[model samples]
Target: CQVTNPSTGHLFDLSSLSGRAGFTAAYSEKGLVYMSICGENENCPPGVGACFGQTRISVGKANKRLRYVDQVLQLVYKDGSPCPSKSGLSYKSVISFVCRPEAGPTNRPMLISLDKQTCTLFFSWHTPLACEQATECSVRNGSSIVDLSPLIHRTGGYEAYNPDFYINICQPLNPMHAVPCPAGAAVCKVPIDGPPIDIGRVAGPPILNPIANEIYLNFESSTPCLADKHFNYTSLIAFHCKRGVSMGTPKLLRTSECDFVFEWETPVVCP
Candidate 1:
């Protein structure tokens, strides 16, 4: 029903998608399944968010679809139900929501996956409702992204919008200045405090967001908060299209408890 975004402390309520008759997925010849977002599937047992059928109906297993995490909803079905060739494992489904800002409200799951070892079913749904647009900070600290498409190195570089994801950081060797970082880190920097939160060590590669022909780079450290123990940190290096203002030294914005946000507002971010 409600899932929490660990980074922003934002809550996503999918109660609106719990349709009248529930969304159905008829796969595997005569095998079919029914699922709901905020409530139990139609005709399914109480607390069951999905039901599986062979030729009409065999047994409902989607044990109980509950909140798992941001954009990912995990549901499980159990109780030794009569299934077609069961491996004696619980019927599980990990419904992952893909943020499609340019879509028509909601789209019935565009993809699905099945497994026998654990009897797991994976559902990949494209929903505009999955787009995150909240601005907040918490233990999983990170700055707000303004109208940017969040990518996670998907297959085929086929995310629909950006196709050049099959990019290489460095290949044929274009040597530049000799840069230096901490002992081992992808995102490294000494925080205004603490043991130099190289927490960005596990940060994702920098991503760009071009709005109205102007591009801004987002350098965030959302994981491996090793130094800060259990908090998140993200920094944004943005450009202010203004020409001759020189350059401002990069500084870390601290909010106690190691919640750091770094930024740059110079023409440097511009071409």
Candidate 2:
């Protein structure tokens, strides 16, 4: 499907995202949803919003009879099945692209809202290529200067336990971990039973997701793993939007062996 910004006349061509079934956001409210950003989602009905509410329901339990894609990368899908029961109502997913000049092809999708009454779901996606006019980290040569000094948390960074980690954005994590992360480490990964890996580039700049108060940082081991697998690592931190409140202990998700994501509800990055 074609997505465009009418105001800026920017066309978002989905050529890169046209994979086997396009880009599938693994988690959603109703069920696992997929998006065929360049064409129809696999198994979706004709004429539906190909991007939103796009899903293939459980065979014995539900049926998805509607799906469609809209401009501005808005995806909406409706169920002919269930998820607390969709009642054939539409669920909308809004795609928000994040700009990362140095980022690779990595992608992230999040379900940010659920509204049964209105039959809507808010979704956010962070991608390096989601900008109208690509800028290294900025564009349009206006707006004085965007100051983001407050996002720095080097002193205490942000903490979560269990397997234990101390993470910081735009700088090395809180160096004062009990296990202690070395210099240039953005995420100090201290597993319950393994040697610590100070995963990251010292002084490597972090990329910020302007829309959701999120940030993305990448790191790699000075030493290789098996001397063959991908050596890069990642951290995507979602700064809790509310001020002065905490999501308690930060929730961490190891999406892969090397990519670490966290939902730390803190006012630290809030406006």
Candidate 3:
């Protein structure tokens, strides 16, 4: 489970709260968990008692005896103003929590695998409430945070954290395959010995098959290859390939004698 400070955009792991000043977690009657956070004295400037930021989370079991719980966090600001739009505001803060039953013994985001080639992260567990409700989820590394919610792919299970939850993380890119190539336009031959001189535009919409984790694009042309040029369909397709995050190598297939097909798998949805 985790809590987020909207004002500062800092995510606090509930399990890591022990021994931290101004942070508390306790079990209440009837399977309720109470958590609180107060700004540190150093958080204030000059004479202020504190930074005027406070947050409390109340997690109640879904049923009187069940372990699953519904949680809510309320923020209190000294001036009764809203949370800050940007980081570093003294009185601006917010918090929220999530429960994941499938996080295994660690009770954290469990790594299913990492594809370094694509810079993708895969996990299985309960989907974070923040990921489902907030505009985006933050992936923190050192002092940097990347918005990965848009790229999260839920493979299965209920919306909230559930046993069947799974996600694949990857940076999304703009649609490049959607651009069409004109017929008979000069196109580079596959396994080129030199730079491509002229390549025809690609044809058709790039179809994303999420279930299959593949993208499909088509190319067609009336022009024949140069007499001296020897090519594989895959080589011509590679010229237009955009790099960022993908599940596998791009493949080109000749459907008809003149029609060519290009396809690849992506870890997440493409924009």
Candidate 4:
């Protein structure tokens, strides 16, 4: 009996083809016939490919044998016309086929490693026969699913058959909390008696120069206090201090305070 191509409304008959033992006849709206055998078998004829050892007959075999044999078969147009010049339809007269093996453990997704510091996730997978088509595969993380079709590129080997596929997911870092500092003109404070002034909460660690009697403390502020504030214009304590002995107003001598580093020169008193 003949069938109608729902896509193009073309009418074609599979029954018109000769009959065989293990092959099946199928029709396409694109003016092409498909004869495929489902499994592997030695029954296929010398020229025809078939699954098992099904006896070979003319190219067109019984609809049942051709229906699900383990081999391949040739195609013929409904009007007995020559294969069309259309590149796609050129294979209408004859077609080749192969029965792919079942998927194994290698086909599943494999986790490579997750980087906690950078919050990056990595994954790997073995390429299956069907994976050649992007739509055939996908990746999932918890409830989140991503289509790996477009990102599926070959890696590791130069040839088409070599190499596996991998994907990386990077997450953004969390924002830092705002560090509180002392109020008013004194961004940082120095004790009247000794070294190691308390600069509130600084960005990094504190630097102390015992030899030069200088202290460098980096504050988290963007705009640090500078020499002009009368804090400490010069390396001498007189710049920021009211008297040679009393504690002087704090001054930002270096660059910006956003990671500001304050240099304080302690009094050199040795009696």
lDDT of each: 0.42, 0.46, 0.28, 0.25
Off by over 4 Å in 1: 26-32, 43-48, 54-65, 68-73, 77-87, 134-271
Model 2 misplaced stretches (Cα beyond 4 Å): 1-148, 154-157, 202-215, 226-228, 245-250, 268-271
lDDT of 3 by residue, 1-271 (tens): 3455555565545334222133322122333212223232233332221222233211111111111212223222222222234333223222222222123233322222322332222222232332222322343333533333433333321111111111122211111121211111223222233322222322333333445434433343334445323432221222122346544433444433333443333332333
Looking at model 2, residue 185 earns an lDDT score of: 54
Best by TM-score: 1
Candidate 4 at 16: error in angstroms? 93
State the displacement of the C-alpha of residue 241, model 2, in Å, after optimal TM-score superposition.
2.6
Mark the 10 consecutive residues where model 3 has the least summed lDDT.
Answer: 57-66
* Tens digit per residue, CA lDDT, model 1, 1-271: 5566778776766667764367866565555677776556665666566666543332234432455443344444444243355555455566665444354433675224455455656565545565564211111113533332222212212101110111101010011122111212223443332333332322233345444433333433445444665666543433344465554433443334444444434443344
- Alpha-carbon lDDT of model 2: 0.46
Provide TM-scores for the models: 0.45, 0.37, 0.20, 0.17
| RMSD (CA, angstroms), candidate 1 | 13.4
For residues 77-167, write the lDDT of model 2, one tens digit per residue: 4432344544545444334333333354436554444455554544445444454433222112134333334555524466665566776
- How far is 53's C-alpha from truth in model 2 (Å)? 69
- Candidate 4 residues lying further than 4 Å off, grouped into runs, are 1-200, 203-206, 221-243, 256-259, 265-271
